[PDB]
């Protein structure tokens, strides 16, 4: 089997769509654009 979760660091950056950890407030910035915008799926009509 497998067990040990240690990946923490408790970074002062985090994602509000994943919850991810940075460093700095610039490449938390630059990962957000990759969540507002996926393929094309699921036509929510406004
Ligand atoms: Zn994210």
Known sequence: ???GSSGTGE???KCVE???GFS???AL???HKLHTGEK???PSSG
Do not use: E, I, L, T
């Open 1 to 3: 089997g497998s067990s």
């Open 11 to 13: 970074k002062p950056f």
């Open 18 to 20: 994943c919850g991810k």
């Open 24 to 26: 700095r407030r610039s």
């Open 29 to 31: 910035n630059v990962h």
């Open 40 to 42: 094309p799926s699921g």
